[PDB]
Amino acid sequence: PKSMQCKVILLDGSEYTCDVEKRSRGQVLFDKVCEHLNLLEKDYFGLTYRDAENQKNWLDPAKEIKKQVRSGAWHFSFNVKFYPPDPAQLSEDITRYYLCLQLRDDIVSGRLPCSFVTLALLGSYTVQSELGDYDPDECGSDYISEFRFAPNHTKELEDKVIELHKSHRGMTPAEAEMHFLENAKKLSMYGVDLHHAKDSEGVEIMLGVCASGLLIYRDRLRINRFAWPKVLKISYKRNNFYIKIRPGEFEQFESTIGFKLPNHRAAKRLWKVCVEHHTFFRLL
Numbered sequence: 212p213k214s215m216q217c218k219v220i221l222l223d224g225s226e227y228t229c230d231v232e233k234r235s236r237g238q239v240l241f242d243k244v245c246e247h248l249n250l251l252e253k254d255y256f257g258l259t260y261r262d263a264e265n266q267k268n269w270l271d272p273a274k275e276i277k278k279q280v281r282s283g284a285w286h287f288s289f290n291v292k293f294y295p296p297d298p299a300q301l302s303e304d305i306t307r308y309y310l311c312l313q314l315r316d317d318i319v320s321g322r323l324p325c326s327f328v329t330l331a332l333l334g335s336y337t338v339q340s341e342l343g344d345y346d347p348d349e350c351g352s353d354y355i356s357e358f359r360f361a362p363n364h365t366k367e368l369e370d371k372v373i374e375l376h377k378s379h380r381g382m383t384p385a386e387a388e389m390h391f392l393e394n395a396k397k398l399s400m401y402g403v404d405l406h407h408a409k410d411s412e413g414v415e416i417m418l419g420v421c422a423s424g425l426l427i428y429r430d431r432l433r434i435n436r437f438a439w440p441k442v443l444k445i446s447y448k449r450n451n452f453y454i455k456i457r458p459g460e461f462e463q464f465e466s467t468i469g470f471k472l473p474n475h476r477a478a479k480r481l482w483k484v485c486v487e488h489h490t491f492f493r494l495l
């Protein structure tokens with residue numbers, strides 16, 4: 212029985228290696244990675260890979276791995292797929308831990324924009340969880356943490372992490388991680404998957420996919436939103452993506468809204484993640 216080596220970048224930046232049978236469905240590899248991680252609340256997570264166009268794709272656990280990675284390497288990342296709107300309702304601390312690791316990368320990468328003060332507050336909770344109570348011995352007036360807190364580090368940000376870290380004495384790791392999440396979940400881009408697009412008139416927009424629906428970003432004026440329950444049908448055709456909206460009260464007709472994506476793969480990718488969000492957050 213012929214086996215393919217899989218490599219998975221974990222959220223702590225370490226590499227997990229295993230073998231699966233070459234005709235294996237994605238779920239096989241996902242189950243091995245979650246067992247490695249001691250993760251039971253698996254439904255929020257997934258594996259990604261980079262395609263022949265170097266775009267992020269979710270590995271579909273119900274499809275053969277070989278039919279998704281096709282010509283590319285069997286190289287994956289373990290990621291949060293569905294960001295819970297209320298992480299306090301997760302059953303296990305370890306789930307919250309992995310969600311914090313993902314959010315730390317969302318912040319350092321700049322996918323999750325964050326004010327100076329919230330960068331410092333999130334950093335302070337991470338330091339409190341992982342090192343415990345503040346110790347002056349380790350940190351002089353010139354201390355720079357090894358922890359990555361932001362897309363751009365400043366001395367002033369390091370100073371503020373330390374000042375807030377002092378205020379968390381006695382706080383235990385699950386408690387600090389819960390505080391991390393109670394702050395992070397409020398950020399306007401929390402759990403938003405962003406896709407470049409153009410409207411039916413050719414204006415550059417961004418489409419954001421998240422728990423609360425499909426968001427349309429044009430600039431800093433007029434953020435439109437379609438809550439998932441209003442969305443009856445999502446579809447794609449060539450480079451175009453369409454949403455069918457329920458008729459409003461007393462309206463005779465449904466309305467279809469059309470967008471232009473970079474190419475056909477990008478339209479299919481956006482369709483798939485919208486359908487998955489719609490189903491997941493209908494049920495959650």
Ligand SMILES: C[C@H](O)CNCc1c(Cl)cccc1Cl
Pocket residue numbers: 218219220226286287288
């Ligand atoms: C630098 C990595 O730790 C080792 N390289 C394997 C690899 C690559 Cl190149 C890309 C995405 C996932 C994986 Cl697993």
Ligand SMILES: C[C@H](O)CNCc1c(Cl)cccc1Cl
Pocket residue numbers: 407408409415416417
């Ligand atoms: C290349 C850089 O990311 C600039 N952005 C281009 C862009 C954006 Cl932000 C949104 C929609 C369409 C397009 Cl083309």
